[PDB]
Swiss-Prot record, chain A:
Belongs to the WD repeat COPB2 family. One of its GO terms (cellular component) is COPI vesicle coat. The keyword Cytoplasm applies. Disruption phenotype: The knockout of the gene results in early embryonic lethality with no viable embryos recovered at 12.5 dpc. WD repeats lie at residues 13-52, 55-94, 97-136, 140-180, 183-224, 227-266, 350-388, 390-425. The lineage of its organism: Eukaryota, Metazoa, Chordata, Craniata, Vertebrata. It comes from the Eukaryota. It comes from Mus musculus (Mouse). Keywords: Acetylation, Coiled coil, Cytoplasm, Cytoplasmic vesicle, ER-Golgi transport, Golgi apparatus, Membrane, Phosphoprotein, Protein transport, Repeat, Transport, WD repeat. Oligomeric complex that consists of at least the alpha, beta, beta', gamma, delta, epsilon and zeta subunits. Probably interacts with PEX11A. Interacts with SCYL1. Interacts with JAGN1. The coatomer is a cytosolic protein complex that binds to dilysine motifs and reversibly associates with Golgi non-clathrin-coated vesicles, which further mediate biosynthetic protein transport from the ER, via the Golgi up to the trans Golgi network. Coatomer complex is required for budding from Golgi membranes, and is essential for the retrograde Golgi-to-ER transport of dilysine-tagged proteins. This is Coatomer subunit beta'. It is a peripheral membrane protein. The chain holds residues 1 to 604 of 905 of the full protein.
From Swiss-Prot, chain B:
The keyword Nuclease does not apply. Pfam families: Adaptin_N, Coatomer_g_Cpla, COP-gamma_platf. The keyword Transferase does not apply. One of its GO terms (biological process) is vesicle-mediated transport. One of its GO terms (molecular function) is structural molecule activity. This is Coatomer subunit gamma-1.
Swiss-Prot record, chain C:
The lineage of its organism: Eukaryota, Metazoa, Chordata, Craniata, Vertebrata. It is a peripheral membrane protein. This is Coatomer subunit zeta-1. It comes from the Eukaryota. The keyword Cell membrane does not apply. Keywords: Acetylation, Cytoplasm, Cytoplasmic vesicle, ER-Golgi transport, Golgi apparatus, Membrane, Protein transport, Transport. The chain holds residues 10 to 148 of 177 of the full protein. Belongs to the adaptor complexes small subunit family. Oligomeric complex that consists of at least the alpha, beta, beta', gamma, delta, epsilon and zeta subunits. The coatomer is a cytosolic protein complex that binds to dilysine motifs and reversibly associates with Golgi non-clathrin-coated vesicles, which further mediate biosynthetic protein transport from the ER, via the Golgi up to the trans Golgi network. Coatomer complex is required for budding from Golgi membranes, and is essential for the retrograde Golgi-to-ER transport of dilysine-tagged proteins. The zeta subunit may be involved in regulating the coat assembly and, hence, the rate of biosynthetic protein transport due to its association-dissociation properties with the coatomer complex. It comes from Mus musculus (Mouse).
Length: 604, 798, 139
């Protein structure tokens, strides 16, 4: 299945062998330790350095942020532990815990702890509240302690990896593991945990190119995986998607689906080997140290697929990667604007294709959903497949009765009820296609207007946008185009005549179609037509509607979000997160209308 | 032999540790044997057995692991506890004796329950999915019995679930699909996009192909769309490979030609036919009987002779014997050859693979293609039938006689003649019973009295009070009717023929006595044995009393409209009714989804071209797949320009309530959502009776007089009525006239001077003079006896 | 496909020393015998290349000592169906180094049994070739 997916080369740096990486969540800062011996902390967002520290100039193996603590923890292989309060980078304390090359720290978050593993064949626990006591020493070694990871899930219990090939999982009441298991046929480089609390897997790494999965509760190697191209420097659990990240001793990325387990893809930033990895716990952004540098990639959608019937059911599907099996919500009750609400429970669905679009039929009704690149349309109540095919790009014929498609070539065919509509068949350069009332083909950094029955270049305007929302009846239409935004009139009659006369301009489209009413310089988180009113979000998180020459913020939102739906009757807006708590604020549409009409001189 | 007893006692063997795998296994075997052969027993003992057995389980004694599986295996939809193992299942689960693990799960699943269902689940998910093909297989089978029970637990998992079904072993690949038999039972759409997956890849298991075929086929009947390329694609696919079954499979359905497909397909088929034509696929026989249908087309038929001749000739192979009868039959035969065959048959039929049965089937077909018809054949056959005989004809006779009756055969004189005679000296009392009964009814409608009498006497002639008796009973229908001579004599006869022998005496006496008892004529008798269609609807509607006017229905709907499109949850078909005063839309239906029952139902209509809107009515409750009625009512304004044709806007409102169909619940709560309601448009034919005039000449003019509106168009891009024509005959629903209707596939000029009467009593009249100069310019007149119609017609016609 | 009404290995004394009604919906040990009787008595060690009884496929065989019955529906092609039937003779023969006999039958049932479950399990033929089996099994 396709990479029609989010992969972003989020941030780059080319550097050295950056051994270690550690994440500051609480503010998405990242800490990295180098084979240089200098460590740096960056705000990636603008490729800006939050702080750098020369902790040692010997390669600095281990790093943590202690967020709770508000301090940042550092260690270099002067075998000393140096502390900074990250709240400057003011350096708090130093002392010598482990006297050999200190490989890893694992931390109890709940409980005030710093766990360390070091090459001394020792794991020591030190207590920060006790002011770096060596509270307890965990031993049962056979070699250098290469890695420690805390099962944070049960913080409390943790697992250890060594290249003598074995793994000890421990209980506090075992300053030794509970047991050791004889994992590798190589060495166990690494041990990692399974994001879910529900089930339990570890992945452990080797360069032997074999992966074993283990279920702790049973205590099995669930299974052992092969296929590989080169010594897997690392392989990781995708915590967002069910995929397997494989990494190599050459810095090869191979992905196997942690569901298909089919090689979904190979990527080369041959920046050489997977030294480190660290992942967003919000499960979406990840960074790995490579030799030639490091790269960070951004990998997410911002939504599920759902569309809401104005009775009041936003039927979404899935949750985040859960089966689609879950749609419904007519609710049953009422409560205060600020306060929160209850859902119903009765799934339908359990599709396979993984979507990223939902769009309702124009009457809510028929949704066409695309995923895996093909479109299943559902008969919804029916839970029937209304229909399917493979896309590239789309417009419903807004009317609620036809649809258009952009074939994964790029040349148009349109179908109304599986009949191609060729009365209209430009196939010009595009960019994207827009439907609605009036046909857009967005092409050649222009947006070009077309008929609905034959094509006509109605108009072309200056540039290309990103999105269109049309007023409801089409009329005044709203196009979202980065920061900036415009509101327009489309004037029919001219066309009728002009057309009759035939002789026109269409390079530009015909200058005798549309008019440019006014423009707001705008940034949109999400946006809305209330009729022709543009009620909109801004990504600056004020919910405003541009009204009357005025834009007013009804309210400003946490941070910005998704517009649940205003079921007008109720006159309220349901606001929607993506975490399935709905908030509602009533307006009263009439008020707007009242305003609309009166200005129009419909005072009465 | 079998018996429980030794074994229960013998359970103390469990007590030993020195045992040999063999020794015990056998003992275990003995119990299982009784059972394999069949046994029945108490639970208590079974339970006990379990315990006893269960008791043993230190080892991994492999052999030991299997037997129990059996044992357990014996119990699955009629079990005894589940829990006991549990541990043991898990033990496998962490435990790599891979082998074993798989059998155990499999048994459980007929035996299962929901809580316990909860158990396997994360793992399970894995497990189905897990590793070596072998293990995975083991997993699968297990569900199915649980599917009996249910399986939905599974089901759910599905968007996500299927994808793993992606395969890399043939055997496996085949298997995946059946589960998909039920999967596709659940869904059709899914297939379609799916197929393009199935379609997308060439397949492994001949086996996999097969299910698809049925399916594929299944799809085809009404058409599987533009099977052209697929069908074709398939066509190769079925057509050749190294696995025969597919080609054949395809072949039998696919013909297509009564003046239809025969192209490639006949040759390919031929390659096959011939190829098969000696028991390659002894399959070939069945097909001709129907699967690959035959009743031919005329030159085509002649070609068929050779193949049938091979079978006909060969006479062997059960598969052959059957084949002979179907092929010959389907293709049909000349008289002549039959002759040769009759002799062949003479030997053959008795046993020649046990020909008689195929033959009786064949025979049943014979009776049908000629069930007393080609009577010459029927007789030739008859002679032959009796003759070749054995005895086995009798069975056949049951059919044959039946066939003759089905025709209600008319060369009876002859047919009967053979029957009568032969049967006499072809015996079997039993036949006589049946035939008697039939004959019993028939009598003098088919005459030939003397003969028939002649017969009848004979039939009686035979002894048996009983044999004798039938001639009298048959006679009652007959007697009563009398024939070409009978009543006088009919009276004379019962007298002439008379009998003693007590109860036989009695029969004569009694029939007589019975006869004695009623006036024989009577005796025989006892013993022997506007305000339209639509008005009705006005009345049908009438049982309700929430009215706000009605009238009497004038005309009804020219077309009922499904107000919810195809096969929707709230499937609606609507019918509209016109009365002289009101129009009612009464709404016909099947609140579709078993999801729902709709409650608090009423129907909104909102209008454009007049009607006074009195009310929206809805049905109180609508459960699934069951008409209920909802109505919407209007009163019809008649003398206005623009006032009864209307489109009304519909929105369905209901409080939507969920169902349990098993046993439900009906409670005050549940919440509304409203769904769009389809338009209703009202016609100029729901209201009208189309007519011929009370006075056309006069009326024709007259209607002009008071009434007349006009529209003219001059037609310059098309010089054809026809477009116009499509809108006018059809929209108005009236009669085109003044002998001014008719046009062939062309015609120079046309007038419809056209009729019917509108609701509210008064008439709506139209003259359309279509004029062809060679452009068309035309005068459409509407003239009316009602004001609202002249404006209307001109519109409405469109 | 949950398609075995029963597979029986019958003696040709109308006896049945094996029956598994993989699938069943009619009963009685008697009726089973009766049903058996009509057909068995009739086929009487004789079999047919093909036989259909009940619109249903009857594939049955005979050995040199034993009568094999499978009942299925003529609603699923011979070639495959037989293939399983074939599989049944052959593997038993090779593996054991001996095919069925009355004698063989008499000494031990189990192996048949062992095999049978493996091959088929109910109305779904999980498998129809020996080899897999042959390795798979090792008893």
């Amino acid at each position: 299945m396709p990479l029609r997916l989010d992969i972003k080369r989020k941030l780059t740096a080319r550097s050295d062998r950056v051994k270690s990486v550690d994440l500051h969540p609480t503010e998405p800062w990242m800490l990295a330790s180098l084979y240089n011996g200098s460590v740096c902390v960056w705000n990636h967002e603008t490729q800006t350095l939050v702080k750098t520290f020369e902790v040692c100039d010997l390669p600095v193996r281990a790093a943590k942020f202690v967020a709770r603590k508000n301090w940042v923890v550092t260690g270099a292989d002067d075998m000393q532990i140096r502390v900074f309060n990250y709240n400057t980078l003011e350096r708090v304390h130093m002392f010598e815990a482990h006297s050999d090359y200190i490989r890893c720290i694992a931390v109890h978050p709940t409980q005030p702890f710093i766990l360390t593993s070091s090459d001394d064949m020792l794991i020591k626990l030190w207590d920060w509240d006790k002011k770096w006591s060596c509270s307890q020493v965990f031993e049962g070694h056979t070699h250098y302690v290469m890695q420690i990871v805390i099962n944070p899930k049960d913080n409390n219990q943790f697992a250890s990896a060594s290249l003598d090939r074995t793994i000890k999982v421990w209980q506090l009441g075992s300053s030794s593991p509970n047991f050791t298991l004889e994992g590798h046929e190589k060495g166990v480089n690494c041990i990692d945990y399974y994001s879910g609390g529900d089930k339990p897997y570890l992945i452990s790494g080797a360069d032997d190119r074999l992966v074993k999965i283990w279920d702790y509760q049973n205590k099995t190697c669930v299974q052992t995986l092969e296929g590989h191209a080169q010594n897997v420097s690392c392989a990781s659990f995708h915590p967002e998607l069910p995929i397997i990240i494989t990494g190599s001793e050459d810095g090869t990325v191979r992905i196997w689906h942690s569901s298909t387990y089919r090689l979904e893809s190979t990527l080369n930033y041959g920046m050489e080997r997977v030294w480190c990895v660290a992942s967003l716990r919000g499960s979406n952004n990840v960074a790995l140290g490579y030799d030639e540098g490091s790269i960070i990639v951004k990998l997410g959608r911002e939504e599920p697929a759902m569309s809401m019937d104005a009775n009041g059911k936003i039927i979404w599907a899935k949750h985040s990667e859960v089966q689609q099996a879950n749609l419904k919500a007519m609710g049953d009750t009422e409560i205060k604007d600020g306060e929160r609400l209850p859902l119903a429970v009765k799934d339908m669905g359990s599709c396979e294709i993984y979507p990223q679009t939902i769009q309702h039929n124009p009457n809510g009704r028929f949704v066409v959903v695309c995923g895996d690149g093909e479109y299943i349309i559902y008969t919804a109540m029916a839970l029937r497949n209304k229909s399917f095919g493979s896309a590239q790009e789309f417009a419903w014929a807004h009317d609620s009765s036809e649809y258009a498609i952009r074939e994964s070539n790029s040349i148009v065919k349109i179908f109304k009820n599986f009949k191609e509509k060729k009365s209209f068949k430009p196939d010009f350069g595009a960019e994207s296609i827009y439907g609605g009332f009036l046909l857009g083909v967005r092409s050649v950094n222009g947006l070009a207007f077309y008929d609905w029955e034959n094509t006509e270049l109605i108009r072309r305007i200056e540039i290309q946008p990103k999105h269109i929302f049309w007023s409801d009846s089409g009329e005044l239409v709203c196009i979202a185009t980065e920061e900036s935004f415009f509101i327009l009139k489309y004037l029919s009659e001219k066309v009728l005549a002009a057309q009759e006369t035939h002789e026109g301009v269409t390079e530009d489209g015909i200058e005798d179609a549309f008019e440019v009413l006014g423009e707001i310089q705008e940034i949109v988180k999400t946006g809305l037509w209330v009729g022709d009113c543009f009620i909109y979000t801004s990504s600056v998180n004020r919910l405003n509607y541009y009204v009357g020459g005025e834009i007013v913020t009804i309210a400003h939102l946490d941070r910005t979000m998704y517009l649940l739906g205003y079921i007008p009757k109720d006159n309220r807006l349901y606001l929607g997160d993506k975490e399935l708590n709905i908030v509602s604020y009533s307006l009263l549409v009439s008020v707007l209308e009242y305003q609309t009409a009166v200005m129009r001189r419909d005072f009465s | 032999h079998l018996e429980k007893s030794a074994v229960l006692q013998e359970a103390r063997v469990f007590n030993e540790t020195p045992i040999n795998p063999r020794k015990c296994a056998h003992i275990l075997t003995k119990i299982l044997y009784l059972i394999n052969q069949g046994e029945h027993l108490g639970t208590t003992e079974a339970t006990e057995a379990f315990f006893a057995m269960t008791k043993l389980f230190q080892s991994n004694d492999p052999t030991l692991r299997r037997m129990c599986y059996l044992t357990i295996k014996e119990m699955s939809c009629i079990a005894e506890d589940v829990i006991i193992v549990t541990s043991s299942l898990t033990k496998d689960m962490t435990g790599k004796e891979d082998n074993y693990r798989g059998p155990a799960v499999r048994a459980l699943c007929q035996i299962t329950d929901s809580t316990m269902l909860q158990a396997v689940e994360r793992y399970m998910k894995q497990a189905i999915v897990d590793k070596v093909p072998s293990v995975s297989s083991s997993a699968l089978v297990s569900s199915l019995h649980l599917l009996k029970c249910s399986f939905d637990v599974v089901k759910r998992w599905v968007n996500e679930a299927q994808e793993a079904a992606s395969s890399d072993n043939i055997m496996v690949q085949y298997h995946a699909l059946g589960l998909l038999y039920h999967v596709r039972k659940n869904d059709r759409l899914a297939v379609s996009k799916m197929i393009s997956k199935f379609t997308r890849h060439g397949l492994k298991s001949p086996f996999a192909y097969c299910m698809m075929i049925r399916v594929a086929s299944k799809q085809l009947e009404e058409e599987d769309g533009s099977r052209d390329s697929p069908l074709f694609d398939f066509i190769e696919s079925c057509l050749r490979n190294k696995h025969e079954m597919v080609v054949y499979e395809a072949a039998s359905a696919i013909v297509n030609l009564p003046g239809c497909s025969a192209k490639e397909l006949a040759p390919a088929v031929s390659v096959l036919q011939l190829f098969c034509s000696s028991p390659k696929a002894a399959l070939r026989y069945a097909a001709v009987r129907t699967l690959n249908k035959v009743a031919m087309k005329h030159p085509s038929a002649v070609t068929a002779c050779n193949l049938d001749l091979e079978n006909l000739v060969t006479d062997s192979n059960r598969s052959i014997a059957t084949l002979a009868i179907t092929t010959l039959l389907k293709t049909g035969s000349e008289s002549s050859i039959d002759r040769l065959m009759k002799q062949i048959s003479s030997f053959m039929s008795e046993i020649s693979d046990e020909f008689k049965v195929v033959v009786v089937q064949a025979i049943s077909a014979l009776c049908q293609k000629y069930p007393r018809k080609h009577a010459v054949l029927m007789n030739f056959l008859f002679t032959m039938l009796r003759e070749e005989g054995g005895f086995e004809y009798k069975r056949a006779i049951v059919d044959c006689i039946i066939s003759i009756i089905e025709e209600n055969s008319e060369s009876k004189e002859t047919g009967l003649s053979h029957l009568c005679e032969f049967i006499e000296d072809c015996e079997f009392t039993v036949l006589a019973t049946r035939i008697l009964h039939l004959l019993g009814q028939e009598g003098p409608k088919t005459n030939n009295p003397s003969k028939y009498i002649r017969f009848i006497y004979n039939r009686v002639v035979l002894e048996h009070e009983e044999v004798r008796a039938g001639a009298v009973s048959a006679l009652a229908k007959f007697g009563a009717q009398n024939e070409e001579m009978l009543p006088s004599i009919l009276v004379l006869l019962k007298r002439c023929v008379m009998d003693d022998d007590n109860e036989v005496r009695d029969r004569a006496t009694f029939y007589l006595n019975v006869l004695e008892q009623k006036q024989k004529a009577l005796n025989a008798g006892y013993i022997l044995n506007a305000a339209t269609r639509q008005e009705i609807f006005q009345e049908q509607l009438a049982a309700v009393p929430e009215f706000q006017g009605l009238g009497p229905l004038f005309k009804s709907s020219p077309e009922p409209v499904a107000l919810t499109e195809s096969e929707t949850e709230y499937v609606i078909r609507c019918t509209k009714h016109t009365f002289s005063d009101h129009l009612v839309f009464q709404f016909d239906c099947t609140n579709t989804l078993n999801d729902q029952t709709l409650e608090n139902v009423t129907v909104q209509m909102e209008p454009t071209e007049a009607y006074e809107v009195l009310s929206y009515v809805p049905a109180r409750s609508l459960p699934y797949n069951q008409p209920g009625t909802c109505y919407t009512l209007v009163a019809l304004p008649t003398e206005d320009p623009t006032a009864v044709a209307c489109t009304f806007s519909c929105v369905m409102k209901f409080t939507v309530k969920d169902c349990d169909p098993n046993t439900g619940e009906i409670d005050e709560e549940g919440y509304e959502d409203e769904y769009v309601l389809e338009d209703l448009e009202v016609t100029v034919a729901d209201h009208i009776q189309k007519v011929m005039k009370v006075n056309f000449e006069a009326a024709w003019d007259e209607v002009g007089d008071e009434f007349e509106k006009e529209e003219t168009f001059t037609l310059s891009t098309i010089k054809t009525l026809e477009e116009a024509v499509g809108n006018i005959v059809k929209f108005l629903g009236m009669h085109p006239c003044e002998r001014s209707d008719k046009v062939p596939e062309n015609k120079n000029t046309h007038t419809l001077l056209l009729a019917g009467v509108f609701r509210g009593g008064h008439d709506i009249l139209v003259r359309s003079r279509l004029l062809l100069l060679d452009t068309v310019t035309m005068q459409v007149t509407a003239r009316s006896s009602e004001e609202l119609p002249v404006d209307i017609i001109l519109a409405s016609v469109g | 496909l949950y398609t075995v009404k029963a597979i029986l290995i019958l003696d040709n004394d109308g006896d049945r020393l094996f029956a598994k009604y993989y699938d069943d919906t009619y009963p009685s040990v008697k009726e089973q015998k009766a049903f058996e009787k009509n057909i068995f008595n009739k086929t009487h060690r004789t079999d047919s290349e093909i036989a259909l009884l009940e619109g249903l496929t009857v594939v049955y065989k005979s050995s040199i000592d034993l009568y094999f019955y499978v009942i299925g529906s003529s609603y699923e092609n011979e070639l495959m169906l037989m293939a399983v039937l074939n599989c049944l003779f052959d593997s038993l023969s090779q593996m054991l180094r001996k095919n069925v006999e009355k004698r063989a039958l008499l000494e031990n049932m189990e192996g048949l049994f062992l095999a049978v479950d493996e091959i088929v399990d109910g109305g779904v033929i999980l498998e129809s070739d020996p080899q897999q089996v042959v390795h798979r099994v090792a008893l």
